[PDB]
Design a protein around this ligand. Structure first.
Ligand code: NA
Ligand code: NA
Ligand code: NA
Ligand code: NA
Ligand code: NA
Ligand code: NA
Lengths: 173, 173, 173, 173, 173, 173
């Protein structure tokens, strides 16, 4: 049953990777939902839509890299259902950016737990993988989303509809 | 509540589109699963892996086009959970191609039902959308998968391991 | 006696680096041996020969990078005899790939021990060096060799002489 | 008061980053001082001057990267006075290179303490940042300065004025 | 003790140049502080950040040119501590621009005093240096900052958060 | 047991080739050792290091050409341990060049014995191989090393540290 390639790869690490795959796929689905909210005729913020669609595709790439890792290490991928997002209607550009920030911080927390597990199981390859490919990407994403939230709030969103319009044009365009 | 853009778009059509979105996303997940099966060190068929990953990405594009349609017509997207695929281990190149063929025929059946609904609701735009973007793509996919299954069977798959190897190289490479 | 550059570099780490240098040079010699086995007129698998010669040269580069590290840190290189490989005749493409896989896993185990030592001696530079330059390279090598072994076995090697021929052409060519 | 972006970032880490910023800015000032010493009409070693000015600019870049990190993590930058360098007159090319080596080793020691703190506070992002951007740069700098000191000493500096002249031309030019 | 190059260069002029070096380095530090304030996640004005960072680098260049002058004339550079800026938190784009304007006027006043000293000591080279390299640069800087302050005030800064956003985009971008 | 290709290839010749392979690999290891001696922070002669590393790689190529010959003729390669070099510390550029000259003359003597054996066994192909690929290369190498030794001695090495520095720059650079 043990893979010919497997070396220094704990069952707990393998399980945590499978959980992370699901979380990344979930995040991709959330961003997809947000994207198409902004594409609605009654919302009509094209650059918000583009921004979130890009994020969706990036999360899918992150999931696929974890799947690749699992196989590289001789673990076995077990997929689970991808839960639907928490909202159908994301309310506003500001509300979506705030929800994105919350999601990114949740993903980051999971990655930090995975890193801790890798370190505890003396799996330096896995720890390095997470550091190299995931942790700075998350810090950057969180900082960007925080910047966006700050700007939208300062401009008068979400009650000032001119604010979201201009942010869409000048920041996200 | 009715969208400013909505015209000649039945509630039943809107609901059927939402179901089709889920089915396309499901198909994408199935193909993703198959892809990474072929990437396993104990399977190691890189061009099978590439083939299925391409299919996964294509299905996601199909889902996104339906989401775009929903918004174009003034319907509202309601996402559902994406169910996990039926298998974790796809057994062989031949078995995966057979499962893909079955999936594609199921997707095609759903599209034919959607077309019938559009025609019944006198929605020519929707009927044309399905014909133009979906039905020939499905016929082509089904024909290709059938061709692949035929070739693999004729070559001696899945018991002849040389067969899958050579198919991977010469057909899928 | 202490180098002007030396800082946070334990004697145990210095000794472990010297051992690793020898192991890399040994691995280079093994791969060289395998290469020229495949060049024999009674074996005659040119792409196996090329594959192993490339690996030989890569291992030598790995050894030289460790020598560079030793000097960068102010340690002192002490070379030892390079032991001859365990075989003169490597039997088959499959047997050589299996022996390579075993060797790579042994090298990886040594690197993981070196990383553990670096972490225990609070030498983050050394730990990072190993992670950055060695550990993912080893995981990739192990995965590749496992893939090769799987394919050769599935094709009917080493009793099916057509298998090795075709693998040589299509995978290694 | 807590930043919206802040996650897994200890107050002690934030404080240590602020100290490191000051130390990098200090090092920049030292190198600036050395540069302009070599530009004196009674010293007149242009390539020594260029070498140290480059180092000055590099240290400033290092400080700015730490400031960027502080903000990325949601810490708050607190600047302090930049102390004047220990010397106004650096005596000789050899003496300056020796002083530079001492400075670089002091900076490295501070970075190693920061890495230890990050590891103790289970802050893998910060630890990785230091490893990736700072620790190998310091090892390289220390090795280069040691090489320069060795060459100058071997050539007969600082009593052989021809030595510094020729080193300036052939090594630093 | 007197430099071989020294001619018509008064001790008072030499001392004033040393003071000016410190003031330029101080101004560089102020602008650096302002830059990174605008990079905060709770401020998030990237083009303000860029503007001030550019100014920081320009002030450092100004300091280095004075150091070059000192050596050209046979004076001796004596560096002093670089005092920390007066604020850690610069409040707003408008407040920072106002603080910059005040700083630039203070630097200009010091340069005008230096010019007066040069003229009083019959040092035409020094007077010309200041006129050529410093005085028009200061007048231009002051005019630019005044223009920026006027525009920000007219737009409704700092209470109108849309004002700073749009200024950042359209003037500073 | 006799190779299908073997013709006019004496067992004594086959054995001598195996010995020569080992000697070339030994020489490669010696040069590698010397290279990294010059890379030490307390030696710091980069062009000496480069020179010897080049020689190391050339000797490995020479060994591989002999391995190719062995297989071309239907002999069988038998590898032996590669002995460690006689020194860990090579003392000086001059001492290393003198040791290299001694090594090259020893290698040449072995090649001349191999040529004599080939001629005695009426093996013109082998004799021609040695003449064409080895003997002029050795004469050239010996002449070059002798030239280097002469120049270093004339310049005042190894007691004049300026000599080795300048030789490193002007001859080896
Ligand atoms: Na992600
Ligand atoms: Na589809
Ligand atoms: Na290696
Ligand atoms: Na630095
Ligand atoms: Na200035
Ligand atoms: Na040779």
């Amino acid at each position: 049953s043990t893979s010919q390639v497997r070396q220094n790869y704990h069952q707990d690490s393998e399980a945590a990777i499978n959980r992370q795959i699901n979380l990344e796929l979930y995040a991709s689905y959330v961003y997809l939902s947000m994207s198409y909210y902004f594409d609605r005729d009654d919302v009509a913020l094209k650059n918000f839509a583009k921004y979130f669609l890009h994020q969706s595709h990036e999360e899918r790439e992150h999931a696929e890299k974890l799947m690749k890792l699992q196989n590289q290490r001789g673990g076995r991928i077990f997929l689970q259902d991808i839960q639907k997002p928490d909202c159908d209607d994301w309310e506003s550009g500001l509300n979506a950016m705030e929800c994105a920030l919350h999601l990114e911080k949740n993903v980051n927390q999971s990655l930090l737990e995975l890193h801790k597990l890798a370190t505890d199981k003396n799996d330096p390859h896995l720890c390095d993988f997470i550091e190299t490919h995931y942790l700075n990407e998350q810090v950057k994403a969180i900082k960007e989303l925080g910047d966006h939230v700050t700007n939208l709030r300062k401009m008068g969103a979400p009650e000032s509809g001119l604010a979201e319009y201009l942010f869409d044009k000048h920041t996200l365009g």
